[PDB]
Amino acid sequence: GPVPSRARVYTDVNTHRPREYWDYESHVVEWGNQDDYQLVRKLGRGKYSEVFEAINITNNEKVVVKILKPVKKKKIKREIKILENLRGGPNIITLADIVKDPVSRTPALVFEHVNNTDFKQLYQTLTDYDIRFYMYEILKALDYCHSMGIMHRDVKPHNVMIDHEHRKLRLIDWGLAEFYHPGQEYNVRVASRYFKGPELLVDYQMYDYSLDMWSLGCMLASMIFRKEPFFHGHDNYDQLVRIAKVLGTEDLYDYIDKYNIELDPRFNDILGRHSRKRWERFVHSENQHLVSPEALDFLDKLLRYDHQSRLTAREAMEHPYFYTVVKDQ
Ligand SMILES: O=S(=O)(c1ccc2nc(Cl)sc2c1)N1CCC2(CC1)CC(NCc1ccc(-c3ccccc3)c(Cl)c1)C2
């Protein structure tokens, strides 16, 4: 069978807490009054929810409402619990209330309101310094949630929100997040394809917070190289080929060895044989101003098949890539 794995950091953090903290199945939900909020306009449709801008008529404060589509109550209790646990944390979205339509029986999450600067405007103006800063800001949120025994499992640009006018960032969409418990086997059918770690793709279920660090590298790549998505797999199998065509098949077979992982008979056809490529080959004139020795060192140390050899969030925050941003503090 597969070799076990535990987290190198924040391993026993949920164990040292009361059971209620992570036994979300037991959480009873504090309902608010739906008539305190009126919906203004729709902001987005999104697989598990629809998102609206609303006003709280109690204090005339602008708000965000995610009306949920039908999920199991235990997954809602999960998200609510994780949000409540992380509330007040750096760059974590703030849950403000929870309400149910007394007729449709549909439940709705009410959030603080953050203006998103227009994608086009932001993307075209970004700058290396800006990327550094906002990555630092994402790392802050991740080290916080990891320290609080929680893995997001859906880190990607969709779930990051930036108000550039106020240099303000939030990490959202906590509905796939789970509590890390050593020895636990998780579902590998999580996150979107382009951001899935190797461990999900080879079906190693004793994963941990380091899953987030892979995605974060997947994010950094697309930004510095200006290629979204960076690993563009046609299906879950081809996603690992895309990764192997860059990272090389050798470190991959070394990883499945160390963890005595059994590859579906399929991959053993498509994976083939692939040298580990150098980053220079994704550099061109239009991205060079984002790419730097510091950045490629940072990226290399996140994009590793072996989850145990990835940088932790706190080590990442200590990386030379962010030396300038930390001095502003
Ligand atoms: O209208 S929504 O559905 C909405 C509105 C309010 C709301 N409030 C709660 Cl509560 S949930 C909710 C949902 N919608 C807004 C727009 C998004 C999707 C959701 C977030 C945007 N993020 C793109 C992005 C992320 C990171 C970077 C980046 C920049 C520099 C270094 C690294 C990364 C860049 Cl360049 C771009 C796309």
Side-chain angles (χ1 to χ4, degrees), residues 1-19 21-29 31-46 49-60 63-119 122-123 125-164 166-188 190-225 227-261 263 265 267-268 270-272 274-287 289-326 328:
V3 172
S5 171
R6 306 293 181 285
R8 345 139 52 204
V9 288
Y10 303 136
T11 318
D12 301 300
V13 84
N14 288 324
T15 311
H16 295 318
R17 293 221 213 239
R19 80 139 203 34
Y21 179 90
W22 49 262
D23 188 25
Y24 50 80
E25 287 182 1
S26 294
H27 181 71
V28 3
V29 172
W31 297 104
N33 179 29
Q34 128 145 136
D35 302 2
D36 289 355
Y37 312 89
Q38 305 177 316
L39 304 191
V40 177
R41 67 209 176 70
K42 189 180 312 207
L43 305 170
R45 195 235 86 203
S49 82
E50 298 206 307
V51 184
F52 300 75
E53 208 210 28
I55 190 91
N56 185 312
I57 65 191
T58 287
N59 43 33
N60 299 131
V63 124
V64 163
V65 179
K66 289 181 66 256
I67 303 177
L68 304 182
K69 297 169 182 146
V71 175
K72 292 175 73 188
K73 265 180 210 215
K74 56 151 70 142
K75 307 299 187 196
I76 313 181
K77 284 174 206 264
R78 194 180 66 201
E79 184 174 356
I80 291 173
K81 192 71 205 173
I82 274 161
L83 278 173
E84 283 177 359
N85 289 354
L86 299 185
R87 194 193 292 138
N91 302 326
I92 311 277
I93 195 74
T94 306
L95 185 68
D97 205 357
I98 314 156
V99 300
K100 174 181 279 148
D101 177 42
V103 172
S104 81
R105 289 280 108 186
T106 319
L109 295 183
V110 181
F111 289 91
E112 64 168 321
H113 168 94
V114 170
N115 311 309
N116 255 109
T117 54
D118 159 71
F119 186 76
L122 190 63
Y123 180 81
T125 53
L126 259 200
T127 84
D128 177 27
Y129 184 85
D130 285 335
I131 297 170
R132 279 167 203 229
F133 171 100
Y134 285 116
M135 286 285 298
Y136 199 72
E137 289 308 305
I138 300 164
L139 276 168
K140 269 207 246 194
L142 283 170
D143 185 48
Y144 187 64
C145 80
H146 294 171
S147 72
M148 298 294 283
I150 287 146
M151 357 169 246
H152 196 264
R153 303 198 301 175
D154 198 37
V155 177
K156 78 191 203 197
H158 186 282
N159 299 326
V160 178
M161 279 181 65
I162 299 164
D163 177 358
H164 187 77
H166 304 107
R167 304 206 96 217
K168 166 207 290 191
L169 180 149
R170 286 300 184 287
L171 176 50
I172 61 160
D173 284 357
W174 286 97
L176 265 178
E178 195 50 290
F179 296 85
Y180 175 70
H181 297 308
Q184 197 164 116
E185 277 174 345
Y186 296 96
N187 183 27
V188 295
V190 294
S192 54
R193 203 194 344 270
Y194 301 146
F195 296 87
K196 280 177 186 267
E199 57 266 54
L200 311 187
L201 301 169
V202 300
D203 192 21
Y204 187 77
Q205 311 189 250
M206 218 170 283
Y207 65 71
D208 63 69
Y209 313 109
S210 48
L211 179 57
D212 292 331
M213 298 310 297
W214 174 273
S215 312
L216 183 82
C218 287
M219 257 179 77
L220 177 70
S222 67
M223 294 300 293
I224 64 175
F225 295 134
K227 195 210 173 301
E228 229 285 337
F230 187 73
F231 298 111
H232 196 5
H234 295 329
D235 58 65
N236 297 289
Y237 297 84
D238 192 64
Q239 184 68 14
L240 191 56
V241 186
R242 290 287 198 248
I243 293 163
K245 280 167 171 280
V246 177
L247 285 195
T249 41
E250 205 75 68
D251 294 344
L252 171 65
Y253 286 121
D254 276 338
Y255 162 75
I256 79 95
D257 266 349
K258 168 166 162 187
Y259 292 95
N260 185 244
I261 298 172
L263 230 18
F267 284 115
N268 306 89
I270 189 59
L271 295 174
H274 304 279
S275 81
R276 183 177 53 95
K277 301 309 185 303
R278 294 178 169 72
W279 297 109
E280 50 179 44
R281 70 159 59 199
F282 308 111
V283 189
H284 51 72
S285 47
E286 306 88 11
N287 70 10
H289 63 94
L290 310 178
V291 177
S292 74
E294 348 303 305
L296 298 183
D297 198 90
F298 174 47
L299 177 68
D300 185 76
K301 289 181 176 158
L302 296 170
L303 290 189
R304 267 134 191 229
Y305 295 115
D306 189 349
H307 58 281
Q308 280 172 17
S309 65
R310 294 180 199 145
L311 284 181
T312 299
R314 198 114 58 167
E315 290 165 344
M317 286 192 281
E318 283 171 12
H319 194 285
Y321 179 59
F322 306 101
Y323 277 0
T324 46
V325 341
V326 304
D328 294 26

